[PDB]
Design an enzyme around this catalytic site. Structure first.
Site, PDB file in Angstrom:
ATOM      1  N   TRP A   1      -6.556 -16.972   1.991  1.00  0.00           N
ATOM      2  CA  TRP A   1      -6.340 -17.535   0.659  1.00  0.00           C
ATOM      3  C   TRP A   1      -5.699 -18.915   0.706  1.00  0.00           C
ATOM      4  O   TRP A   1      -6.061 -19.789  -0.088  1.00  0.00           O
ATOM      5  CB  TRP A   1      -5.468 -16.598  -0.182  1.00  0.00           C
ATOM      6  CG  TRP A   1      -6.088 -15.240  -0.412  1.00  0.00           C
ATOM      7  CD1 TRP A   1      -7.007 -14.910  -1.363  1.00  0.00           C
ATOM      8  CD2 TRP A   1      -5.819 -14.042   0.319  1.00  0.00           C
ATOM      9  NE1 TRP A   1      -7.330 -13.577  -1.271  1.00  0.00           N
ATOM     10  CE2 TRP A   1      -6.620 -13.022  -0.239  1.00  0.00           C
ATOM     11  CE3 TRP A   1      -4.975 -13.730   1.391  1.00  0.00           C
ATOM     12  CZ2 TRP A   1      -6.601 -11.714   0.232  1.00  0.00           C
ATOM     13  CZ3 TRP A   1      -4.958 -12.426   1.860  1.00  0.00           C
ATOM     14  CH2 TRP A   1      -5.770 -11.436   1.280  1.00  0.00           C
TER      15      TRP A   1
ATOM     16  N   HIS B   1       0.812  -1.217   0.000  1.00  0.00           N
ATOM     17  CA  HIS B   1       0.000   0.000   0.000  1.00  0.00           C
ATOM     18  C   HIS B   1       0.846   1.268   0.000  1.00  0.00           C
ATOM     19  O   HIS B   1       0.432   2.278  -0.582  1.00  0.00           O
ATOM     20  CB  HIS B   1      -0.964   0.021   1.194  1.00  0.00           C
ATOM     21  CG  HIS B   1      -2.172  -0.839   0.987  1.00  0.00           C
ATOM     22  ND1 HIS B   1      -3.375  -0.618   1.626  1.00  0.00           N
ATOM     23  CD2 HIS B   1      -2.359  -1.925   0.199  1.00  0.00           C
ATOM     24  CE1 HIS B   1      -4.250  -1.529   1.235  1.00  0.00           C
ATOM     25  NE2 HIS B   1      -3.661  -2.332   0.368  1.00  0.00           N
TER      26      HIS B   1
ATOM     27  N   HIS C   1      -1.076 -12.534  -2.090  1.00  0.00           N
ATOM     28  CA  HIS C   1      -2.102 -13.307  -1.406  1.00  0.00           C
ATOM     29  C   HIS C   1      -1.653 -14.725  -1.092  1.00  0.00           C
ATOM     30  O   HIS C   1      -2.441 -15.500  -0.545  1.00  0.00           O
ATOM     31  CB  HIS C   1      -3.388 -13.293  -2.231  1.00  0.00           C
ATOM     32  CG  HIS C   1      -4.020 -11.937  -2.280  1.00  0.00           C
ATOM     33  ND1 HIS C   1      -5.093 -11.630  -3.090  1.00  0.00           N
ATOM     34  CD2 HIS C   1      -3.716 -10.801  -1.608  1.00  0.00           C
ATOM     35  CE1 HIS C   1      -5.427 -10.364  -2.909  1.00  0.00           C
ATOM     36  NE2 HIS C   1      -4.608  -9.842  -2.014  1.00  0.00           N
TER      37      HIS C   1
HETATM   38  C1  HEM Z   1      -6.474  -6.520  -7.454  1.00  0.00           C
HETATM   39  C2  HEM Z   1      -5.511  -6.300  -6.553  1.00  0.00           C
HETATM   40  C3  HEM Z   1      -5.714  -6.457  -5.023  1.00  0.00           C
HETATM   41  C4  HEM Z   1      -6.861  -6.452  -4.320  1.00  0.00           C
HETATM   42  C5  HEM Z   1      -8.314  -6.247  -4.828  1.00  0.00           C
HETATM   43  C6  HEM Z   1      -6.521  -6.645  -2.926  1.00  0.00           C
HETATM   44  C7  HEM Z   1      -7.408  -6.686  -1.878  1.00  0.00           C
HETATM   45  C8  HEM Z   1      -7.082  -7.015  -0.585  1.00  0.00           C
HETATM   46  C9  HEM Z   1      -7.980  -6.985   0.549  1.00  0.00           C
HETATM   47  C10 HEM Z   1      -9.479  -6.590   0.513  1.00  0.00           C
HETATM   48  C11 HEM Z   1      -7.289  -7.365   1.630  1.00  0.00           C
HETATM   49  C12 HEM Z   1      -7.848  -7.488   3.066  1.00  0.00           C
HETATM   50  C13 HEM Z   1      -7.402  -6.346   3.984  1.00  0.00           C
HETATM   51  C14 HEM Z   1      -7.928  -6.685   5.359  1.00  0.00           C
HETATM   52  O1  HEM Z   1      -9.179  -6.743   5.514  1.00  0.00           O
HETATM   53  O2  HEM Z   1      -7.100  -6.914   6.278  1.00  0.00           O
HETATM   54  C15 HEM Z   1      -5.922  -7.641   1.227  1.00  0.00           C
HETATM   55  C16 HEM Z   1      -4.928  -8.087   2.071  1.00  0.00           C
HETATM   56  C17 HEM Z   1      -3.621  -8.369   1.707  1.00  0.00           C
HETATM   57  N1  HEM Z   1      -3.024  -7.944   0.530  1.00  0.00           N
HETATM   58 FE1  HEM Z   1      -4.141  -7.730  -1.266  1.00  0.00          FE
HETATM   59  N2  HEM Z   1      -5.142  -6.796  -2.817  1.00  0.00           N
HETATM   60  C18 HEM Z   1      -4.610  -6.679  -4.084  1.00  0.00           C
HETATM   61  C19 HEM Z   1      -3.268  -6.743  -4.396  1.00  0.00           C
HETATM   62  C20 HEM Z   1      -2.226  -7.065  -3.545  1.00  0.00           C
HETATM   63  C21 HEM Z   1      -0.796  -7.061  -3.856  1.00  0.00           C
HETATM   64  C22 HEM Z   1      -0.192  -6.633  -5.214  1.00  0.00           C
HETATM   65  C23 HEM Z   1      -0.135  -7.449  -2.754  1.00  0.00           C
HETATM   66  C24 HEM Z   1       1.388  -7.611  -2.502  1.00  0.00           C
HETATM   67  C25 HEM Z   1       2.253  -7.840  -3.494  1.00  0.00           C
HETATM   68  C26 HEM Z   1      -1.109  -7.731  -1.729  1.00  0.00           C
HETATM   69  C27 HEM Z   1      -0.810  -8.179  -0.463  1.00  0.00           C
HETATM   70  C28 HEM Z   1      -1.724  -8.409   0.534  1.00  0.00           C
HETATM   71  C29 HEM Z   1      -1.512  -9.168   1.755  1.00  0.00           C
HETATM   72  C30 HEM Z   1      -0.203  -9.876   2.195  1.00  0.00           C
HETATM   73  C31 HEM Z   1      -2.645  -9.140   2.462  1.00  0.00           C
HETATM   74  C32 HEM Z   1      -2.840  -9.848   3.829  1.00  0.00           C
HETATM   75  C33 HEM Z   1      -2.816  -8.800   4.940  1.00  0.00           C
HETATM   76  C34 HEM Z   1      -2.829  -9.438   6.314  1.00  0.00           C
HETATM   77  O3  HEM Z   1      -2.614 -10.677   6.434  1.00  0.00           O
HETATM   78  O4  HEM Z   1      -3.044  -8.694   7.315  1.00  0.00           O
HETATM   79  N3  HEM Z   1      -2.368  -7.480  -2.236  1.00  0.00           N
HETATM   80  N4  HEM Z   1      -5.819  -7.391  -0.133  1.00  0.00           N
END
Ligand code: HEM
Ligand code: HEM
Ligand code: NA
Ligand code: NA
Lengths: 717, 717
Positions: free
Chosen positions: A298, A85, A247
């Protein structure tokens, strides 16, 4: 409405809402900076113990804190999201956003809906910041923690560069016109996203995890994913690698109703110490956490790198369902996979789940070809994610000279707009003087030389630190063809002559001294300015710093340079079609991208006009009777009350300035007349227009010129 | 609503309308200043040929320009109005406004309805500014031109001081809450004007020339005249003298309808070159001029000093009538005085006229006594006008050491808060060191010494440069009784002990060296800081500059010093009743008046808390275990996530910080917790709370302390 105290934000914008705002030219002012004027972050972080820093971050990642307990006992996944982010606000259209200034810790980014819970994530790293102090910026720490998170959970990264300098005020950026969080007023035609934006709704990073405007259609969402990521410099392969790679870790949080989550950090009460989104659902944290409102895990290995994400994505069939907060998500059909996904705090296992935007990777035909290949050949995913993650986290770092530390990888990357290393001894004072004299004798005019030098150097933008005169890319595509640069073919003649001077100097040169075309472009401008100032009765020497090298076309990504083309350059009285605001606004925006103050912008415009730098050598703003002469005539005539100005009857963006005899004496654009009309700019014009001002004008012009020529010269800083 | 581009004013205030605005701590930033960091106006002023400058202004006053023809062939009266309006924004509650920054040339003042036509007035002076350049500020020129106008038309002034340095962006000041020009939402009760304002409607200088809210009752108008002028530091005799003195000259302008007058300067199109109020009534200038809408010529000699104003005021009876633009004014009854008042452009003579507010001078019993006397004693009027006009245009000049040039008379003036000349040799390094030891051995505590020194120095405000530690006025009325200074309190004891040290040193000192009480108050705080730093394990020296002198009570105007009393001082955690905004806004407001940056405010708060400088030695914000030791404990403990903060159940402006055991460990106020909650201030706290930061903190604290101690010391710079 009511006017407020200035300390509560009241000010002149309240009375004149559309007024030019010169605050954009004094961002991050030194008086607000707590560090000494001699502070040099590059010097500080160059001495950090990266090994100890890593071990300390690894300790933070596995030491759960009671005010935000660690999912699965590991904060790594949260730190990966935090870093993605931080880098994920970057936009190619103006180069703004990105992680390079640590802006996630300031408003508005610290309070965007999509940055929910990252307030706790940044707080968890204060023990590291506390220990390393001025050797470690928040800007570096936020992305390095994501990089360390990957490595500690089994993914080897490409490398990492330090050097992002902390700032003390938020950069003010246009994020959209919507006055409601998550609002959408930014599409036209057939889903054309308004420039310069790179997200589909106000306060989102890229796309909506529930599908376009919350319609969970994976095919339609892929369209939004592809275009927003494109506007963040990521192609189809890079985009799929990043989503699959991210993810692979962690989970979403939506344990309960979102209306139990309190105000965002900037809106929250003092006792919360800068944290926001306080939740009254259960404990409001950990097992009860609410961030997005979605409840997806996931992979069966949220704290480990492996190929589980694609095996699950392709190994089940997917059904639409709702999270405990009521958001759309997908679950495996027919109760398949029951209990196979671990719970973050030791609860019972759960079923496979995916976001609508994850299904895009399987439903969209292009993403399907990419991700099915990685299902069969996972080592290609690891390779593409390592390259895409490195690009993502460094996209706004500027020339590779800025990258510091023992983790910087040697390999050259096309997206870094590389320039060759210096391969010979550099011209000294004697050779510089000789080249100046030769260029002045070459038959090139002051206007041609100044215009060409300005065209090369002013392509720099301080947002992502791309562009500039290093590389000599003015003679390569696409810069050689840019409308503002080459309206009539005159640029090719300048290029040819300078190349001839390069060849004759280099073949005759003493010892191992050689000069680059890129340097000669800039030196040519400096020579012409010395000539013009001599014509005006001033003996000045214009500073010149050698060391630019010449990129090849093959080292120049033509599509990537497309965003650097000026649609407006008030310094050349150039206004193309398509700009968001009237000409005087685009002028200040350009000055901002060139990192210019208001005095610097003012002196530059006045000098460039009389030196003949105008696009197509138009007479607009050329308020002088002298040719090729560096005088302050622009300012003197702008303040002449003997001239009466009216909009040109042709209704063509120009004005006519008539003398007492009704004869048209001058013509001008909005950019010219704004200096005589705006009360703050006019005050600067009265400095440079005074009887005693011509030496100060020449000195201040040369200093500003030299600044612009050096904008991208991080190789010598 | 729609969010705008930053270059059009968009920013974080749009999303969080009431947010603390840290910009008040970086007004007029150096980056926006076109003069070098080395620019020294005092050195430039000293060079000016004031007799030549007077002659050049006299030439402007008698050379009519076609774009604004001169009434009676003389711009003098217009320039008097200009200068009176420049100084006339001043108000005593916060010292803001006045002529000392030339703010009339910037928004919003350049566009106030009461400053109509002064856009042309200032423009007429460009030929003088052009000729003198950096040797003459606009700020000085505007008010000197008014002074020169009086002298050229037969009135000898008291003198004149140069030294107002030009600024480069508007000082943003609260002028009222009305979002409509000439709006009035500032009265309550019978006729109580809200503080801090000193005008009766938004955009007016003092009062409405047609009477209160347009009711031409001269008796009610005098109530407003007396209160607004009082709030501009003028008593009844001064107020009468200024109004008679000004309307001795010139005329008002209301030849046609005000709806034929175009937008004020900040809203006018570019071609008008910064001028506004373009009029389509006739030629829109000169004979057809419209400014206020009133058409009054007060005297038969609009370009000469004599006693005609009072002879006419008392020599006719007055009847209410309307101007050509529909404004109330007064004219002589019975057709008396036909043709006796000359026309500005050779037209036919006209009959005597007056404003409602001029009749106030005859109708109000107090003004009637004063002005009826001057009817037969014009020599007393001239004396009182000279003194009041000098006061008016120098009120915000600060200590008399700032007055520059050859026209400054030496007479001491009570309103200038005078301090004696230095009459003995000053303490040197040996004597300073000895006195520090004596104060450290006197038994006075670090808390007492720091509190008293802060109390003396922090009475300074940079708005009108009144107050500070020079004078030793902390022992005098009224400062010795200010609630924030002497609650209980040790103040009298501190004063007595310091006085004993002064007596003992002076009766045994070397040579002709004597030390003042005022210096000892400051030196005592410096020695205490050295002591507290030693208790923390640091040998430091706090700079100290001698040369303050001791004012007597007779040289201290008690009622004038009333406005300097703080109703809030967050640096001592003092919040009195009656402040306009919550405590964290009053803190930033105070930092602004002390000329402090955000880093300077931050180190000062953290340092003063642990030194024990709090009002009544309250424990709020004293986040340390050491007694009177100079550490960065405030910052470290503010960032301690082991502390959970909640508002105290007593609802008393305080918070409780509990540790893990649930025990209250710390208490704090809004002013304390804002440093941990505000995202920009918390970033600064994280600088000073890092492990490597304690020596930086001490160094910066000392530099900021020394700055406050020296705020009023223009006698030594
Ligand atoms: C279409 C693109 C993407 C969408 C729609 C998306 C959406 C989301 C959403 C809704 C969450 C949940 C946040 C929460 O409620 O805690 C999340 C978490 C996360 N995102 Fe994605 N994301 C995208 C791309 C990415 C990318 C490019 C990365 C890193 C290279 C990433 C890494 C992560 C990780 C590691 C989490 C887990 C956070 C945790 O475990 O606290 N995301 N994302
Ligand atoms: C109760 C206080 C005052 C009121 C209500 C007042 C009101 C006015 C008004 C309405 C005008 C006409 C503006 C125009 O239409 O051109 C004017 C002009 C003028 N004012 Fe006053 N004023 C006050 C105090 C003063 C003071 C204190 C001075 C100077 C010491 C002063 C000096 C002048 C002069 C010289 C003009 C003539 C301008 C010209 O000839 O262009 N006024 N005033
Ligand atoms: Na995994
Ligand atoms: Na007169």
């Amino acid at each position: 409405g009511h006017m407020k105290y200035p300390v509560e934000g009241g000010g002149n914008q309240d009375w004149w809402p559309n007024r030019l705002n010169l605050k954009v030219l004094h961002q991050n002012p030194a008086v607000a900076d707590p560090m000494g004027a001699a502070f040099d972050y590059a010097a500080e972080v160059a001495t950090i113990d990266v090994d100890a820093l890593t071990r300390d971050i690894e300790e933070v990642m596995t030491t759960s804190q009671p005010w935000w307990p660690a999912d699965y006992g590991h904060y790594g996944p949260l730190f990966i999201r935090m870093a993605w982010h931080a880098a994920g606000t970057y936009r190619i259209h103006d180069g703004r956003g990105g992680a390079g200034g640590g802006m996630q810790r300031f408003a508005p980014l610290n309070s965007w809906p999509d940055n929910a819970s990252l307030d706790k994530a940044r707080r968890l790293l204060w023990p590291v910041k506390k220990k390393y102090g001025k050797k470690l910026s928040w800007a570096d720490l936020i992305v390095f923690a994501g990089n360390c998170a990957l490595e500690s959970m089994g993914f080897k990264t490409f490398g990492f560069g330090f050097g992002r300098v902390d700032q003390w005020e938020p950069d003010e950026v246009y994020w959209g016109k919507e006055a409601t969080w998550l609002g959408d007023e930014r599409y036209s035609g057939k889903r054309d996203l308004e420039n310069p934006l790179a997200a589909v709704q106000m306060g989102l990073i890229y796309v909506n995890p529930e599908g376009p405007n919350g319609n969970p259609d994976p095919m339609a969402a892929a369209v939004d994913i592809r275009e927003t990521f494109r506007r963040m410099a990521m192609n189809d392969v890079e985009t799929a690698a990043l989503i699959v790679g991210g993810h692979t870790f962690g989970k979403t949080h939506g344990a309960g109703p979102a209306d139990l989550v309190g105000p965002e950090p900037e809106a929250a009460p003092l006792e919360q110490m800068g944290l926001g989104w306080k939740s009254s659902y259960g404990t409001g944290t950990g097992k009860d956490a609410i961030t997005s409102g979605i409840e997806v895990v996931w992979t069966n290995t949220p704290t480990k790198w492996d190929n589980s994400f694609l095996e699950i994505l392709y190994g089940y069939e997917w059904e639409l369902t709702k999270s405990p907060a009521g958001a759309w998500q997908y679950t495996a059909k027919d109760g398949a996979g029951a209990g196979t996904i671990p719970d973050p705090f030791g609860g019972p296992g759960r079923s496979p789940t995916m976001l609508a935007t994850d299904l895009s990777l399987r439903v969209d035909p292009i993403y399907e070809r990419i991700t099915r290949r990685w299902l069969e050949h996972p080592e290609e995913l690891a390779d593409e994610f390592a390259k895409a993650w490195y690009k993502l986290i460094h996209r706004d770092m500027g020339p590779v000279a800025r990258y510091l530390g023992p983790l910087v990888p040697k390999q050259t990357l096309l997206w870094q707009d590389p320039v060759p290393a210096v391969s010979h001894d550099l011209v000294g004072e004697a050779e510089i003087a000789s080249l100046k004299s030769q260029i002045r004798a070459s038959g090139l005019t002051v206007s041609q030389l100044v215009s060409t030098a300005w065209a090369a150097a002013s392509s720099f933008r301080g947002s992502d630190k791309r562009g500039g005169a290093n590389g000599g890319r003015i003679r390569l595509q696409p810069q050689v063809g840019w409308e503002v640069n080459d309206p009539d073919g005159d640029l090719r003649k300048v290029i040819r002559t300078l190349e001839e001077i390069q060849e004759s100097f280099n073949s005759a040169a003493p010892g191992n001294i050689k000069v680059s075309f890129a340097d000669l472009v800039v030196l040519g401008g400096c020579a012409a300015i010395e000539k013009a100032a001599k014509a005006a009765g001033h003996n000045i020497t214009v500073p010149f710093t050698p060391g630019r090298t010449d990129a090849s076309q093959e080292q120049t990504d033509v599509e990537s340079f497309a965003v650097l083309e000026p649609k407006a350059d008030g310094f050349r009285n150039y206004l193309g079609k398509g700009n968001p605001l009237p000409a005087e606004y685009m002028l200040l925006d350009k000055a901002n991208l060139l990192t210019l103050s208001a005095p610097e912008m003012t002196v530059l415009v006045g000098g460039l006009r009389v030196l003949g730098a105008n696009y197509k050598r138009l007479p607009l703003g050329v308020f002088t009777e002298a040719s090729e002469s560096l005088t302050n005539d622009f300012f003197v005539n702008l303040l002449d009350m003997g001239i009466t100005w009216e909009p040109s009857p042709a209704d063509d963006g120009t004005y006519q300035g008539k003398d007492g005899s009704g004869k048209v004496k001058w013509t001008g654009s909005r950019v010219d007349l704004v200096f005589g009309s705006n009360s703050e700019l006019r005050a600067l014009v009265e400095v440079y227009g005074a009887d005693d001002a011509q030496p100060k004008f020449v000195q201040d012009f040369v200093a500003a010129w030299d600044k612009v020529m050096n904008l991208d010269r991080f190789d010598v800083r």
